[PDB]
Specification:
The structure is cut from a larger assembly and holds chains A (832 residues), B (51 residues), C (396 residues), D (11 residues) and E (407 residues). By secondary structure, chain A is mainly alpha-helical. Chain A is built from 42 helices and 9 strands. In chain A, the strands form 4 sheets. In chain A, strands 6-5-7 form a 3-stranded antiparallel β-sheet, with no helix packed on it. Chain D has no helix or strand. The radius of gyration of chain D is 10 Å and the shape is rod-shaped. The termini of chain D are far apart. Chain E starts with 6 loop residues before the first helix and ends with a helix. Chain E is α/β, with parallel strands linked by helices. In chain E, a hairpin with a 7-residue loop joins β4 and β5. In chain E, strands 3-2-1-4-5 form a 5-stranded antiparallel β-sheet, with no helix packed on it. Chain E is built from 14 helices and 9 strands. The chains are: A mainly alpha (832), B alpha+beta (51), C alpha/beta (396), D little secondary structure (11), E alpha/beta (407). Chains C and E meet through α1, α2, β1, β5 and α7 of C and α2, α3, β1, α4 and α7 of E. β3 of chain B pairs antiparallel with β1 of chain C, so a sheet runs across the interface. The complex binds adenosine-5'-triphosphate (2 copies) and magnesium ion (2 copies). One adenosine-5'-triphosphate sits at the interface of chains E and C. The PDB classes it as motor protein, hydrolase/protein binding. Keywords: 26S Proteasome, Nub1, Fat10, motor protein, HYDROLASE-PROTEIN BINDING complex.
Chain lengths: 832, 51, 396, 11, 407
């Protein structure tokens, strides 16, 4: 029951509700004033159950009707406030919202935080239920979001504040209400919510959250988002708006790390430095610089990696020998086998063996158009000039991941892209694609145009050719290149398609359409002309390339259906389908970790063609990421009976452990070698897996994600896709004549380091507490984003999923996210 | 009376069918086999009815 | 080696403030889950024989399970029926004369006893329930403080599985077997529940009273089974909580019942470090009384690291509070230092009762926001069972 | 002194 | 006055102040859980294959034949031969658990092939002896013998040279050179009962003897000798010792004798006497076969089993002296990545009254201190930090305030 206070309050409210029975003059103004006080007093209190609302369980029918008759002026409105507040406790939303809509205005703050939020929900609920059929109701609701949103901004309720605007579909106002003490909370939230949000709201959020970064002059943060939307114009403005050269310098280093090039006008000061920084010429000096501090300049040899001592010269295994002396010593600037006696080494490889070995010569020395190009002066012109493709890939590979003002790739390669010999051309187009991947340069794209139409070119020349064009125009949907690809793809004949290398033609179509699912509706329309199977296959694969990293559950559901189907011309469509889920889902950690379960189900409940793709699919999900659960999953299928699954699982292990130097993966890899010693095909690739797991002695990562895993690297996602899909048929492609395709990864090959330099670029060894990154979203205050701290004296290495923070407040980094090369600005606030 | 006899006659037939064993199912084994432990005797890989 | 049958943990959704970021992340998990169900169900439906069908006809139904004891000829073995008898059954062709091993559990034809199949994975229901499938949900960030204790328990059960190179590159053998001991309510089992939510290796659990069966050999034989499954499933951790139940100090007992418990300790004492050294099976014991365990069961070599869990210190008690008042709704006046500073030996389980109580003392006054008095009252209401016991004013 | 005793069960 | 929450009160508490996503979000979490539950059941049943051979090595046509012509034969033992007339023997056979029957041979067997006591196979129907069977090789006992020689050599057993020498004169020397024990006519002790504080080297001096055996080493579990069914403990003891006399140069190592060697006491009202009668079947058995035994607690052993008529020799594994602890250290540190200089002699005097194992954990913890801090060389400073955690950290209180009395 109640007490003297409670029972009396029940009567006092009871008298007030009852007295409104008649139309007495001193019953409407007097009573409604009392309800206004008591209801306001309790509701604007601690979370105490609003005694007025608990006692007041009356019906508004009498007052709602007389509301109209009883003084439609102020006396009418007053009743609305009392009934409206009583509505929030009950379930009368439509009426509960529309009372504050029509009733007395006053102000939202006067009622109570609990009331304000409830109106927030209903306002969002009504706005969503209100379509474009009429804005007449929108102006009032829009007016409400004008006042309430400022209410949340102050009250630590930015989450509801951002949540409130997102519900309305319109989030402009945050620009005008965010305080210097709030942009971090709001800007972080949108970046975290943007990935999950579907099209097109997700795109709108990125720009808006990007905009908020603008209003408070946090320029480097605007950079990360600008690329996330993958729109160059907003990048160019920030490039232009950055009146501070230092911020200009840094935002170029993030522009470069993404592989994004914007033609810099000479009006911009330090154009060469910005051009050289953007061209990534300074990368080589650091990489060698990084090595000297780390003491890893000495090159390695295959025998030590394999550890032949512990285990209880065919041309193939020589290739695996040749490859491991690639990746493992790649980018170190010196190899002990491919630089001194190479003519001797290659001569024990028959044709395609020569191709692979020669190409590794360029990958052994990346990012040196001079040193590598000078380490490119003893083979290519071989008595078996067939290996010319080998150095041509090395020629193209060296230019991959960098841009030189002298355009070496086109010069050397062009004279041989028309070379009649089929093998000579394979290196030309492929190597060229690596060098200018994502460049989208019209010249090289144009020069690659005749390659498509050159009928004399063999299909293997063609398949690489379309792939080469795709890798250049990755993520730009280049109308000319797409047209060339789109025009070229249609002209293909049915009989010539049935070959495996025709599997590469659609790949080039997508690689042009990576990251833009809006424009791929048309591209899938044009492809419908060609007849199946490759019509359906290209449709799926083109479909996947459209949604690279979108996080679109819809496409994944669409993609999962294709894999789910149980049918040979249908299995190519399936295999690209499973790899489809891997690419689409690999943006967010929440979804990506879930795709593992789906991948696992596709293996126990899968079929021949699917079971081969799953081992590859896991490869893209966790590239350079030795998650134990995934690495274990590849192993338990690393011995499988089907040769294709055994190979793909072994390759996946190599990718997952790429550059991680994971001891367990190595020990796991070594044991497999002993198990599969008999079969050269397994032993070759298990040996290869050990090769990928030591990429750059671990000083590189093929992960396509930078910027706290947020900023996607378009050119990268092109590479992994080529090898992975090309691995969809390993025996014809991998085990066949196309050992060179493994060089497709070189596009995404990037360094992972923590070298800290002083403001003058001298290495400034700063205590950097580096550990597993922990999200700061939704954590009030200054949450620690690093856990499992292990103070390292920079330079340092960050295994994937790690973040480094400057443990000394002596400096204030220009860019908030400490990845790659960061300009540490000495803190003016710090006092010794 | 007919409905009553039918109940009695049916219960006579059902009541001659031998009672069934009761054993703990250690674990499923496929889709048409389920390991069971009949109380006095040991393990048994029995089938499963269609129902 | 079937490989680590690690627990099945759904990804984690954080923010916890109940913001839309939370709803979206749960939806994404649900979306794939709905998608994943779709494939399982749409794989049986979309999915629409003459070799095996002949085999199943030779076997018939049912098929007995007795223990093989001798392979007399290539096509004859002696199999002991499920009652302890013997039988000179015939070995049919479909059986694999390789997996057939003395001691293996063989499938026998029911009418004419004849080896028909080898039943691997016959681990007792009493040890196959010991395996943790659904990983507990308390991550190392739910355990506050204990950074020195956690690291000690992360260098024997987590690190030796992720970066094995460090240990084998230095000559150590990763410490294997840690005795978590301390006063009641300090966090012994929570740190254990946290290694299961992070580890990628099969996490068997026991309660130190499950492995004492009534039968004379049922006891020592369940322990020999548990360490057979843990070894079988590759990387594994066996968590024998409340180890004081089985392994107390050996003594000349004049009671046969108590000589069978010790005949179970002297099995766990040999299934850990005895002839035929172990493989990769770590053991995490816990106990509130390390002063009664046998000097052998905690002799360095079986329990290498004796993590000691003292009652919370003042800094930890302040971190313990926030981990349990993270989801609460404290008013601006809730300055926790008033309660933490006290010299009361407030355990870490006491802190979560001073949180449950101070949140229920809020419903008393009809408030979902706990003020500062809601903790002062709760501290007293939650602080009994320990009263006040100490010396008088003798010491100055 | 006075000792209470448990017991097993030889099947 | 703790007013109970009125139903009117409850409605407000749960809706007033609710974050508009609360009902939806809590719905999403509830949906997932049920969804996960359903997900497992549709797939939880994982096929457990039943060990069928490859399709090539099948003879399904002949398989139907074996099941049809050949019949199951109960395995029995001939306990006597009546030899009614020497022409109609009328053998008596034991069916193990079934019963004892006076049976006669099926024509296939020869009257002279079934010798008294040998395992005999009978037919389910009449129990006529169809076939002789090889003597019983126990499935458990046969696995007991250590088929893979333990890797620990005698150079890994440090600080116990006089205790190893005392063992080598009972377990190795009288087995490789049975001429020094004959010239003087000394009867070799046919068993030693290694006792010592837990973790002093009892089972390492056991594996070491196994690596240099030249014999058949049987590792008695202790657990298997205590079986549920009555008597099956003793039946195993005999079937182990019997498996030794058959072999030449057999060593039996009963690790943890306390399991089945408890001091006798009348407890017949319980299964304990089942274990005791298994020891009395071992005491009879004990008193070319040498026997070893390890017991960290010898005082709980039956006085009868420790007499010098069964365990002729009792080697005491004491805590090492200083000249041995510096040797136990070097044995475990020969593979560690230590800095060349370590004053192991110094680390021996900081581990007073420390066993041969706690010296090992000092070496294992020493690195863990070198791994916590990224130094790949486990320097001396680490060990003193190691000896503080392994030995001192659990040795005693004996602390500064109570240790400023010693100088
Ligand atoms: N340091 C701590 N940080 C956070 N929570 C803690 C801490 N210590 C204890 N707890 C809390 O204690 C609760 C239960 O205690 P816990 O299970 O850890 O005890 P225990 O060691 O198993 O005790 P016992 O000796 O009774 O078996 C957990 O839910 C956890 O939230
Ligand atoms: N004296 C020692 N010398 C060398 N290593 C030792 C010594 N004592 C113990 N160890 C180490 O410990 C291991 C096992 O210890 P030990 O063999 O003494 O156990 P135990 O005596 O059987 O113990 P318990 O009697 O409780 O079963 C050895 O293999 C070795 O690694
Ligand atoms: Mg506990
Ligand atoms: Mg022992």
């Amino acid at each position: 029951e109640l007490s003297e206070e409670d029972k009396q309050l029940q009567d006092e409210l009871e008298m007030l509700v009852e007295r409104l029975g008649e139309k007495d003059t001193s019953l409407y103004r007097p009573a409604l004033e009392e309800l206004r006080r008591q209801i306001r007093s309790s509701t604007t209190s601690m979370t105490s159950v609003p005694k007025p609302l608990k006692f007041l369980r009356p019906h508004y029918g009498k007052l709602k009707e007389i509301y109209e008759n009883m003084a439609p002026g102020e006396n009418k409105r007053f009743a609305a406030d009392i009934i409206s507040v009583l509505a929030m406790t009950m379930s009368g939303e439509r009426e509960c919202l529309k009372y504050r809509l029509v009733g007395s205005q006053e102000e939202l703050a006067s009622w109570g935080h609990e009331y304000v939020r409830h109106l927030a929900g209903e306002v969002a609920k009504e706005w969503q239920e209100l379509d474009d059929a009429e804005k007449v109701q929108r102006e009032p609701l829009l007016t409400l979001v004008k006042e309430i949103v400022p209410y949340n901004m102050a009250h630590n309720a930015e989450h509801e504040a951002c949540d409130l605007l997102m519900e309305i579909e319109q989030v402009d106002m945050l620009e005008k209400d965010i305080d210097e003490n709030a942009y971090a909370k709001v800007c972080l939230y949108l970046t975290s919510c943007v990935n999950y949000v579907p099209e097109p709201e997700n795109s709108a959020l990125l720009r808006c959250a990007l905009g908020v970064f603008r209003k408070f002059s946090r320029f480097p943060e605007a950079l990360r988002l600008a690329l996330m939307l993958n729109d160059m114009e907003l990048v160019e403005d920030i490039f232009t708006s950055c009146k501070d050269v230092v911020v200009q310098k840094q935002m170029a280093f993030m522009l470069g790390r993404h592989g994004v090039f914007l033609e810099l006008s000479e009006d911009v000061e330090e154009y060469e430095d910005l051009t050289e920084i953007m061209s990534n010429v300074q990368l080589n000096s650091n990489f060698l610089a990084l090595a000297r501090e780390l003491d890893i300049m000495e090159p390695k040899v295959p025998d030590d990696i394999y550890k032949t001592h512990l285990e209880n010269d065919s041309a193939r295994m020589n290739l695996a020998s040749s490859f491991v002396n690639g990746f493992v010593n790649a980018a170190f600037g010196q190899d002990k086998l491919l630089t001194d006696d190479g003519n001797k080494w290659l001569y024990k490889n028959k044709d395609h063996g020569m191709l692979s070995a020669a190409a590794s010569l360029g990958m052994i020395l990346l990012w040196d158009v001079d040193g590598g190009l000078t380490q490119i002066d003893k083979y290519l012109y071989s008595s078996e000039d067939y290996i010319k493709s080998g150095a041509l890939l090395a020629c193209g590979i060296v230019n991959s991941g960098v841009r030189n003002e002298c355009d070496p790739a086109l010069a050397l390669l062009s004279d041989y892209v028309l070379h009649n010999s089929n093998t000579m051309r394979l290196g030309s187009i492929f190597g060229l694609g690596l060098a200018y991947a994502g460049s989208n340069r019209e010249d090289v794209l144009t020069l690659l145009l005749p390659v498509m139409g050159d009928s004399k070119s063999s299909m293997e020349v063609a398949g690489v050719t379309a792939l080469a064009c795709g890798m250049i125009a990755v993520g730009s949907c280049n109308g000319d290149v797409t047209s060339t690809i789109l025009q070229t793809i249609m002209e293909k004949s049915e009989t010539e398609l049935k070959d495996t290398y025709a599997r590469w033609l659609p790949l080039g179509l997508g690689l042009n359409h990576l990251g833009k699912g809006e424009a791929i509706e048309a591209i899938l329309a044009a492809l419908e002309v060609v007849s199946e199977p490759f019509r359906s296959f290209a449709n799926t694969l083109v479909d996947v390339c459209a949604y690279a990293g979108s996080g679109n559950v819809l496409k994944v559901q669409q993609l999962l259906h294709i894999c789910s189907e149980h049918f040979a011309d249908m299995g190519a469509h399936q295999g690209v389908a499973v790899l489809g889920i891997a690419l689409i889902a690999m943006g967010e950690e929440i979804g990506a970790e879930m795709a593992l379960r789906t991948f696992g189900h596709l293996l126990r409940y899968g079929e021949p063609t699917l079971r081969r793709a799953v081992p590859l699919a896991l490869a893209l999900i966790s590239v350079s990421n030795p998650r134990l659960n995934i690495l274990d999953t590849l192993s338990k299928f690393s011995h499988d009976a089907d040769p294709e699954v055994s190979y793909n699982s072994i390759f996946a292990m190599g990718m997952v452990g790429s550059g991680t130097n994971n001891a367990r993966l190595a020990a796991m890899l070594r044991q497999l070698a002993q198990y599969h010693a008999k079969d050269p095909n397994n032993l070759f690739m298990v040996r290869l897996a050990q090769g990928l797991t030591h990429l750059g002695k671990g000083t590189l990562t093929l992960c396509p994600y930078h910027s706290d895993r947020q900023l996607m690297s378009q050119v990268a996602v092109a590479g992994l896709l080529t090898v992975l899909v090309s691995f969809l048929d390993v025996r014809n492609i991998i085990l066949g004549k196309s050992h060179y395709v493994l060089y497709g990864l070189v596009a995404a090959m990037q360094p992972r380091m923590l070298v800290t330099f002083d403001e003058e670029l001298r290495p400034l060894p700063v205590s950097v507490r580096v550990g597993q990154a922990v999200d700061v979203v939704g954590q009030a205050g200054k949450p620690k984003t690093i856990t499992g701290f292990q103070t390292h004296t920079t330079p340092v290495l960050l295994a994937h999923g790690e973040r480094a923070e400057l443990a000394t407040e002596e400096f204030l980094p220009v860019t908030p996210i400490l990845e790659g090369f960061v300009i540490l600005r000495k803190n003016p606030n710090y006092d010794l | 009376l007919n409905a009553k006899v039918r109940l009695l006659r049916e219960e006579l037939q059902l009541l001659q069918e031998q009672g069934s064993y009761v054993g703990e199912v250690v674990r499923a084994m496929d889709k048409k086999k389920v390991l069971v432990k009949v109380h006095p005797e040991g393990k048994f890989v029995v089938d499963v009815d269609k129902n | 080696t079937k490989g680590p049958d690690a627990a099945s943990k759904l990804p984690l959704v954080t923010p916890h403030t109940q913001c839309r970021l939370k709803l979206l992340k749960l939806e994404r998990i649900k979306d794939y889950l709905l998608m994943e169900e779709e494939f399982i169900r749409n794989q049986e439906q979309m999915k629409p024989e003459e070799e095996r069908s002949k085999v199943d006809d030779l076997r018939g139904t049912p098929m007995s399970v007795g223990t093989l004891e001798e392979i007399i000829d290539d096509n004859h073995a002696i199999v002991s029926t499920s009652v302890g008898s013997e039988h000179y059954v015939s070995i049919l062709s479909f059986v694999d004369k390789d997996l057939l091993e003395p001691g293996c559990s063989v499938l026998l034809n029911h009418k004419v006893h004849a080896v028909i199949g080898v039943l691997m994975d016959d681990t007792d229901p009493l040890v196959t329930v010991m395996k943790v499938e659904k990983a507990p949900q308390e991550t190392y960030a739910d355990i506050g403080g204990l950074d020195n204790q956690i690291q000690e328990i992360k260098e024997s059960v987590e690190l030796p599985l992720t970066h094995p190179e460090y240990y084998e590159e230095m000559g150590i053998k990763p410490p294997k077997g840690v005795i978590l001991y301390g006063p009641p309510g300090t966090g012994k089992t929570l740190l254990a529940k946290a290694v299961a939510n992070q580890t990628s290796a099969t996490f068997l659990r026991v309660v130190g009273s499950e492995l004492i069966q009534k039968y004379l050999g049922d006891g020592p034989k369940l322990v020999r089974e548990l360490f057979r499954v843990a070894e079988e499933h590759a990387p594994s951790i066996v968590f024998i909580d409340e180890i004081d139940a089985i392994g107390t100090k050996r003594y000349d007992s004049n009671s046969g019942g108590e000589r069978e418990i010790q005949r179970t300790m002297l099995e766990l004492l040999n299934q850990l470090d005895g002839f035929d050294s172990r493989g990769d099976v770590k053991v995490i014991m816990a106990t509130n009384r390390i002063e009664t365990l046998d000097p052998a069961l905690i002799r360095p070599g079986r329990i290498d690291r004796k993590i000691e869990f003292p009652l919370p210190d003042e800094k930890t008690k302040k971190r313990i509070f926030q981990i349990h008042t993270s989801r609460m709704t404290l008013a601006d006046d809730v300055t926790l230092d008033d309660l933490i500073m006290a010299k009361d030996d407030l355990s870490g389980a006491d802190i979560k009762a001073i949180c449950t109580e101070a949140g229920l003392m809020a419903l008393r006054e009809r408030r979902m926001k706990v003020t500062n008095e809601d903790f002062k009252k709760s501290k007293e209401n939650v602080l009994y069972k320990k009263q006040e016991g100490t010396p008088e004013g003798l010491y100055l | 002194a006075x000792x209470x005793x448990x017991x097993x069960x030889x099947x | 006055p703790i007013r109970a929450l009125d139903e009117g009160d409850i409605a407000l508490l749960k809706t007033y102040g609710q974050s508009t996503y609360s009902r939806q979000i809590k719905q999403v979490e509830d949906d997932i859980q049920q969804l996960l539950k359903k997900i497992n059941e549709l797939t939880g049943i994982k096929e457990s294959d039943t060990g069928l051979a490859p399709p090539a090595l099948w003879d399904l046509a002949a398989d139907k034949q074996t099941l049809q012509s050949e019949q199951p034969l109960q395995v029995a033992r001939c306990t006597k031969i009546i030899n009614a007339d020497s022409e109609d023997p009328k053998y008596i056979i034991n069916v193990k658990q079934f019963a004892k029957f006076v049976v006669d041979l099926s024509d296939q067997v020869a009257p002279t092939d079934i010798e008294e006591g040998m395992r005999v196979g009978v037919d389910r129907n009449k129990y006529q002896i169809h076939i002789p069977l090889p003597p019983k090789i126990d499935p458990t006992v046969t696995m007991m013998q250590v088929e893979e020689k333990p890797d620990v050599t005698y150079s890994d057993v440090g600080g116990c040279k006089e205790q190893i020498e005392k063992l080598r004169e009972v377990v190795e020397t009288p087995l490789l050179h049975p001429e020094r024990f004959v010239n003087l006519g000394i009867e070799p002790p046919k068993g030693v009962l290694l006792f010592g504080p837990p973790g002093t080297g009892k089972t390492l001096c056991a594996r070491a003897v196994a690596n240099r055996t030249d014999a058949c080493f049987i590792r008695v579990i202790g657990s298997e000798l205590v079986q549920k069914y009555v008597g099956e403990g003793a039946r195993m003891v005999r079937e182990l010792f019997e498996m030794a006399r058959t072999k030449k140069a057999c060593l039996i190592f009963f690790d943890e004798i306390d399991a089945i060697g408890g001091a006798r006491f009348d407890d017949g009202a319980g299964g304990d006497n089942e274990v005791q009668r298994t020891m009395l079947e071992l005491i009879n058995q004990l008193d070319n076969i040498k026997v070893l035994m390890a017991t960290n607690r010898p005082d709980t052993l039956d006085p009868a089993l420790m007499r010098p008529g069964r365990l002729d020799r009792k080697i005491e594994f004491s805590l090492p002296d200083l000249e041995g602890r510096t040797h136990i250290f070097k044995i475990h540190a020969r593979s560690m990545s230590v800095e060349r200089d370590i004053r192991f002699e110094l680390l021996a005097r900081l581990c007073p009254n420390s066993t041969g194992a706690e010296i090992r954990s000092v070496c294992t913890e020493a690195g863990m201190f070198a791994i916590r801090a990224r130094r790949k060389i486990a320097t001396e400073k680490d060990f003193l930090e190691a000896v503080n955690k392994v030995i001192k950290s659990y040795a005693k209180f004996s602390a500064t305030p109570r240790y400023m009395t010693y100088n």
